[PDB]
Amino acid sequence: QDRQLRLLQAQIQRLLEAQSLM
Amino acid sequence: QLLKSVFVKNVGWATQLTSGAVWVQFNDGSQLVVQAGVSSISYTSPNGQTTRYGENEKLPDYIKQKLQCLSSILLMFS
């Protein structure tokens, strides 16, 4: 399921950007 | 429930589940579980202790390292 994997990639990237802003 | 498990040297094993989640077994004995639809991440220490973190919590450094390595692993799958 490449769709769910792509959504997961975007999720992890957003989480990492948010964590960088802490 | 399980899909193809991939071995990544110097890191460990990465597995994709039918639910759309990814489960990583690191070579240091720790585990990490993430899911596309869920707003939390699960981390298991080498001692078998599990801790769930939310998206709005400041994560420990090592959790962020493993999330970075996981991001690289997902990148190489393309």
Author numbering:
A (entry chain D): 729 to 750
B (entry chain A): 886 to 963
Question: Which sentences from the paper describe this structure?
Answer:
PLK4, and this interaction targets STIL to centrioles. allows homo-multimerisation, the interaction with the PB3 domain of PLK4, or both. structures and interactions of CCDs and PLK4-PB3s in humans and flies. STIL/Ana2, which can then interact with and recruit Sas-6.
HsPB3 and HsCCD form a complex. heterodimer, i.e. a 2:2 complex (coloured chains). CCD residues interfacing with PB3 are coloured green. highlighting the highly hydrophobic nature of the interaction. previously identified interaction between HsCCD and HsPB3. self-association and binding to PB3 are mutually exclusive events. the PB3 strand-swapped multimer must have undergone a dramatic remodelling.
